[PDB]
Amino acid sequence: MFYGTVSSPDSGVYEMKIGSIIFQVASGDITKEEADVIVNSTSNSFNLKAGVSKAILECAGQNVERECSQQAQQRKNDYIITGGGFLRCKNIIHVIGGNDVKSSVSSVLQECEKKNYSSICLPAIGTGNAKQHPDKVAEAIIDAIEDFVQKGSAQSVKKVKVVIFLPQVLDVFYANMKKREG
Numbered sequence: 061m062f063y064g065t066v067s068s069p070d071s072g073v074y075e076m077k078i079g080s081i082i083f084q085v086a087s088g089d090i091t092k093e094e095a096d097v098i099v100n101s102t103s104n105s106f107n108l109k110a111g112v113s114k115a116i117l118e119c120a121g122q123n124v125e126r127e128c129s130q131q132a133q134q135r136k137n138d139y140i141i142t143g144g145g146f147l148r149c150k151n152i153i154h155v156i157g158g159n160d161v162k163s164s165v166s167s168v169l170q171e172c173e174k175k176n177y178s179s180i181c182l183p184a185i186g187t188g189n190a191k192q193h194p195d196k197v198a199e200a201i202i203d204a205i206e207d208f209v210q211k212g213s214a215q216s217v218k219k220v221k222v223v224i225f226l227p228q229v230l231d232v233f234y235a236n237m238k239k240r241e242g
C-alpha cells in the first residue's frame with residue numbers, strides 16, 4: 061500500500077519511497093550530516109559519551125551538554141529536545157537507546173511535524189551501548205515510518221535518512237528495504 065522501489069541515487073546511498081517520504085540509508089559519520097533534526101541515541105540520564113553519543117556530544121559542544129543535564133533534572137523524560145550547537149541542524153532530539161525503537165521514531169516524526177521540519181537524520185538507534193539486535197532495529201524504524209504515513213500524518217516531513225556507523229549494519233537495513241519493496 062505504501063512502498064516504492066529500492067535504488068541507489070548516489071554512491072553508498074540506497075533509497076525508497078514510503079508514501080510521500082523518501083527513506084534513505086548510508087554508512088558514515090552522522091556528525092558530518094545536515095538536516096533539520098539529528099537524532100542522538102543515549103542513556104536514560106542523557107549524558108552517555110560512548111560510540112555515536114560521544115561523537116554527537118563532542119561535536120555539538122558544551123552548551124548542548126548543559127541543556128541535556130538541565131532538562132534531565134527537571135522531570136522524567138522519555139526523550140529531550142535541545143539546540144543543535146555546532147552540528148548542522150536546527151535541533152537535536154536525544155532518544156534513549158534501550159527504549160522501544162518504534163515508539164522513539166514515532167515521537168521524532170511527531171515533533172518534526174510540530175516544527176514544520178522537512179528532513180531528519182538518525183543513527184541505527186539502540187545498536188550501540190544498548191545492544192539491541194540490528195534487524196529488530198531496522199524493522200522498528202521502517203515500521204514507525206509506515207504507520208506515520210498510514211495515519212496521514214506526513215505533511216511537512218519529506219526525507220528520513222539513517223546514517224549508520226558500521227557497514228555490516230547498513231547491509232541489514234538494505235535487506236529489510238528489499239523485503240518491503242513494491
Ligand SMILES: Cc1sc2ncnc(N(C)C)c2c1C
Nearest residue numbers: 110111112113114115188225
Ligand atoms: C569502535 C567504534 S564503534 C562506534 N560506534 C559509533 N561511533 C563511533 N565513533 C565514531 C567514536 C564508534 C567507534 C570508534
Ligand SMILES: [Cl-]
Nearest residue numbers: 157186189190
Ligand atoms: Cl544505543
Ligand SMILES: [Cl-]
Nearest residue numbers: 183184224225
Ligand atoms: Cl549507528
